[PDB]
């Protein structure tokens, strides 16, 4: 695949829009994460090469990266909505709503600030596609295929930036600025995972089976 055709494949792999249809906010968020995880698995299998990895490697990448992938999606959905986290059309939350549960405001503040950095960099859709895939593939025979796939997605990001027509200097700077922002997405995901693990250990939020499976890996 050409980088253009790889990016089109990621565009085609994009999950559908998901709707959820205090305690209520947390239930909505965990219900949403469970639904989104179902669609995430579908998405990953549509990344060229992914299904040719070992099942072990497929499982470990998704177990490692899922909260980071959820948070990168949230940031993209929120980019044009300052002050808001667009979890879903029927779950639009702000930091005031976050204050209602201990530990959630911190997380929302981190997500809002990182979104704000992407907004300032004017992150483009095709850049988002590549970086979300990179999050999955760069997470903590099959080994060589994975390195090839990550290289391919990285090449596609470089191509997206090249297509912006900005100077060669500015392309390298932009690449670095985007990639450095992902350790911020990952921090946010570490904080979220910690918070959800504590919620699960207390039995405060509902039993959704895929979410629980994916949490238990951690």
């Amino acid at each position: 695949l050409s980088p253009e055709q790889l990016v089109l494949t990621l565009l085609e792999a994009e999950p559908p829009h998901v709707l959820i249809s205090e305690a209520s906010m947390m239930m909505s968020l965990t219900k949403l994460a469970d639904k989104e995880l179902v669609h995430m698995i579908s998405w990953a299998k549509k990344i060229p090469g992914f299904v040719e990895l070992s099942l072990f490697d497929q499982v470990r990448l998704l177990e490692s990266s899922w909260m980071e992938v959820l948070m990168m999606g949230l940031m993209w959905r929120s980019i044009d909505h300052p002050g808001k986290l667009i979890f879903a059309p029927d779950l639009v939350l702000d930091r005031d709503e976050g204050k209602s549960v201990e530990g959630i405001l911190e997380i929302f503040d981190m997500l809002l600030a990182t979104t704000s950095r992407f907004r300032e960099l004017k992150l483009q859709h095709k850049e988002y596609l590549c970086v979300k895939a990179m999050i999955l593939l760069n997470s903590s025979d099959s080994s060589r295929k994975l390195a090839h796939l990550l290289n391919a997605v990285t090449d596609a990001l470089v191509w997206v930036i090249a297509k912006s027509g900005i100077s060669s200097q500015q392309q390298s700077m932009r690449l670095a600025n985007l990639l450095m922002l992902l350790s911020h997405v990952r921090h946010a995901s570490n904080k979220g995972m910690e918070h959800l693990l504590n919620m699960k250990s207390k039995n405060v939020v509902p039993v959704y089976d895929l979410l629980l499976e994916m949490l238990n890996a951690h």
Binding site: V59, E63, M214
Partner: peptide, 11 residues
């Protein structure tokens, strides 16, 4: 459970 593997192996 093994819902992740179920979803990885079916459509």
């Amino acid at each position: 459970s093994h819902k992740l593997v179920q979803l990885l192996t079916t459509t």
